[PDB]
Amino acid sequence: GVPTYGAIILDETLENVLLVQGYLAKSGWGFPKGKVNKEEAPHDCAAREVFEETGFDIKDYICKDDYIELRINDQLARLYIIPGIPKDTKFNPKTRREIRNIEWFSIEKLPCHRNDMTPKSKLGLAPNKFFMAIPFIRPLRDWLSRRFG
Ligand SMILES: c1csc(-c2ncc[nH]2)c1
């Protein structure tokens, strides 16, 4: 799989994160990210995808060692951590044919797993509009604990 790169953008209080909503297969809410181009450097892919999806330029704020990286079905996804972006920042995507909406969400209110259906004696998980974000929520909480207490 081609690796993906993007960002976890937080506000000044460290309470809230920035999610984007796409269309169709990407119909729920997720962190802004995308596939790396041939010969493009990881920090440059992250800034590019985040600028296309949100209109905000992170290049001056990336810290090369501050990220969370997960492998999901043998595809690597890395999101650079970008704290202290004011909640009154105007975000506007390039690509409104790809992005429906852009919003701030409370970190403590986001799920870090989906719910089962063991009320109904049925296997699997119930749908959740935060599917794409879920896998990063517990590692982000643990990384904020370590770096800021
Ligand atoms: C693939 C992309 S996100 C994802 C996931 N979210 C929650 C559990 N697995 C799998």
From Swiss-Prot:
Motif Nudix box: which residue numbers?
Answer: 34-55
Q: So what does mutating residue 53 to Q actually do?
A: Strongly reduced decapping activity
Organism superkingdom: Eukaryota
Localization terms from the record: Cytoplasm, P-body; Nucleus
Q: In which tissues is it expressed?
A: Expressed in brain and testis. Not detected in heart (at protein level).
The entry marks the following residues as binding Mn(2+), namely: 49, 53
Tell me how the protein is altered or processed after translation.
Phosphorylated at ser-249 in a MTOR-dependent manner.
- Nudix hydrolase domain: which residues? 1-131
Q: What does this protein do?
A: Decapping metalloenzyme that catalyzes the cleavage of the cap structure on mRNAs. Removes the 7-methyl guanine cap structure from mRNA molecules, yielding a 5'-phosphorylated mRNA fragment and 7m-GDP. Necessary for the degradation of mRNAs, both in normal mRNA turnover and in nonsense-mediated mRNA decay. Plays a role in replication-dependent histone mRNA degradation. Has higher activity towards mRNAs that lack a poly(A) tail. Has no activity towards a cap structure lacking an RNA moiety.
Subunit relationships = Found in a mRNA decay complex with LSM1, LSM3, LSM4, EXOSC2, EXOSC4, EXOSC10, PARN, XRN1, CNOT6, UPF1, UPF2 and UPF3B. Forms a complex with DCP1A, EDC3, DDX6 and EDC4/HEDLS, within this complex directly interacts with EDC4/HEDLS. Interacts with DPC1B. Interacts (via N-terminus and C-terminus) with TRIM21 (via N-terminus and C-terminus). Associates with polysomes. Interacts with LIMD1, WTIP and AJUBA. Interacts with DDX17 in an RNA-dependent manner. Interacts with ZC3HAV1. Interacts with APOBEC3G in an RNA-dependent manner. Interacts with ZFP36L1 (via N-terminus). Interacts with NBDY.
Spell out the family assignment given in the record's similarity comment: Belongs to the Nudix hydrolase family. DCP2 subfamily.
Q: What is the protein name stated in its UniProt record?
A: m7GpppN-mRNA hydrolase
In its UniProt entry, the species of origin is given as Homo sapiens (Human)
Covered residues, full protein? 96 to 244 of 420
